[PDB]
Symmetry: D3
């Protein structure tokens, strides 16, 4: 049931100084950070990441948004991590996101793009693809978090 998912702490979150608060929510949930780095995405990489939206009217604005400033890309590992992180993220448009979710508590204002604090892979398949776009195997680690032993079935 253990899966890996890719999360991008977007430019709006970085500029607003919310990196730590976002990371803490994942750590507190029990999710493990197995990879992470601050990078500045270029248009080519951005369009590959968001290839599914190439023919949508907001594509250009979305690429401008994700490449506006550096972002923090990270890989989270844990039981059903993909669906869990999507649940934690909340609705795409922050105004519709429920209080308690990341977008619900931190997002609201938008530009030409629907600024929404973070990106979260939408499926195990997508996560695999996205993780490969931003990380090399040598940047992903296997190590124990403090409470790992507690759940070991002997």
């Amino acid at each position: 049931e253990t899966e890996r998912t890719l999360v991008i702490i977007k430019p709006d979150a970085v500029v607003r100084g919310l990196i730590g608060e976002i990371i803490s929510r994942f750590e507190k949930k029990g999710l493990k950070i197995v990879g992470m780095k601050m990078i500045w995405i270029d248009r080519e990489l951005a369009e590959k990441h968001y290839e599914e939206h190439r023919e949508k009217p907001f594509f250009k604005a979305l690429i401008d948004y994700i490449t506006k400033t550096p972002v923090v890309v990270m890989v989270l590992e844990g039981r059903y991590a993909v669906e869990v992180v999507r649940k934690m993220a909340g609705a795409t448009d922050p105004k519709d996101a429920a209080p308690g979710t990341i977008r619900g508590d931190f997002g609201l204002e938008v530009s030409d793009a629907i600024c929404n604090v973070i990106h979260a892979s939408d499926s195990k398949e997508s996560a695999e693809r996205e993780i490969s776009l931003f990380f090399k195997p040598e940047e992903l680690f296997e190590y124990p978090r403090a409470a790992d032993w507690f759940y070991k079935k002997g």
Copy 2:
């Protein structure tokens, strides 16, 4: 899409020392405080604010409640601020409010009135009316919050 809504941090919140925590939730969401002051509402002003409830059985108790101690009235500005703040507030009766919402996390106990931490305008129209009841134009301001520039479409 930018709107203004009126919020009243009720006597129960003031007495319990929750003013700051409530304000922080709005600031963290990205909402801008364009007006704010601690006042002690008298019955006349209270009945004008809650005119819609004049013929309800809980009217008297509600007026007693809102005028019990000083309150903090404030105007919040932001994208769809009215519906967003209502969403953040949660169900009228705190016991029914979802965890994560203001009433959900802070409210529960009631008196003869359903004490519920805060008041939030229910519509743009109501907000306009309520804002006018408590504030003069000279008490409302236009200024930039730190991240405002980020969302400017050039």
Copy 3:
């Protein structure tokens, strides 16, 4: 409307150092701690507490889980405390729990048992029974919390 409910801060929460954070959520909601103690539940007591699950496939694992390390048993008092605490706890399986709830924010990983941070009585009847299992009348108290006077109808 004032009720008492039993909550058990389970071994996973104790080991992870989440006792305080869990307690704070209840205090902030307005709930009153009328009884509380750290104990180490033995199998006999554990099976009495979870008697309803005796014929379920996960029974053995559940008993192992709840008796793994000491836990903190506590009695919470307040308006509709039973349903309110259940609401605050969230879905049984933490991966399904909504962000904002205790299980939603803190739980995810599981062992042979569905580790979910806390236990909360499912009804007033169950609460009565469970409270009696862990506490003697002399361990339960009646005292005023700071804001109690605020809600007194004269």
Copy 4:
């Protein structure tokens, strides 16, 4: 008695950065009572009056520009030895020197031509009295019970 009132100004840097709530919560958590509060936009005349004791100091101009840059939140805190206590909570004038745990220590660092330091706290009972009068009318200050006030009642 030991109960005093002091003036706090949540400065433009704090307002712009969205720290109003976090600052207020620190005072509420300490047990201090907010007896008056409002968001205002200080004009140069009022700013220079508040900081008149620095009228003949080199940093005066930058200070006025800073305090009047955007709206601020002025408030009056009441409580046991509130003046010295709030000053202690504020921390060293230059935030880089302020101890972690203090308001300036946890939230301040960067400066403009002025030493931006998150908040203002009256330095003495005499200054508190003068400052409260500059920003608040008696009609804007209130006497009411905070939840735990009854717990501290002395004598019988």
Copy 5:
């Protein structure tokens, strides 16, 4: 070894104000282990025994009234040099003098006839030993692993 056990009492003011959780979290976050804990309502005999060293001091009576005002939460914290560490976390006896960041510094200020100061922390290993015995039976103290205990294992 360096591992010690100390006694902490979350006093009536903290309980009434709903600060039990916040106080416990500070100890958990520090890495201290809670090996015993319970809510009890201290009677005068036990209160006077705990504070026997102040038996002949003017504030004694007010102190007993205060500590027995409502139920409290007594707990035993275990960890490296726990006695001095918890004392440091507590801060100065009179909360108005306690540094921001400490428990008394962030949460205490107001007083009654007694100097209400949020919590009690054993002042020495000798006092800790005596105090733990007054409130806890060995059967109420436990040895178990906290999540990160394995990380600190020494030697091979």
Copy 6:
């Protein structure tokens, strides 16, 4: 100018305990800018190079074992007098001595054969320069605006 860059390492104890976010938030809240950051697993060669000044010290071996125990998060913080400021935020080397409010003061205590102390902070501008180079390539460090940067613009 007064703007400096310093190197911070969120050590294995912090990573294992899930404190990465809380530590980063303290720097963000202070107003410091993260210009570089990544999770890496330090090897003995790099660890010994970073701590070369302790090459001939008794605790060296335990120190290397500790810093290479699990992955860490290295990051570069930029801001006014960042070196001394971050050091101040970190607190005393041995967490038991660190003041409440500091990172080590609030989060550290227990030790292994090494004095586990949550994070590493460059001790000087010279050390910061050397350390940043050991862990980061210029291509991994960025210049960008944080939300409030405009507020502090000096002069006209």
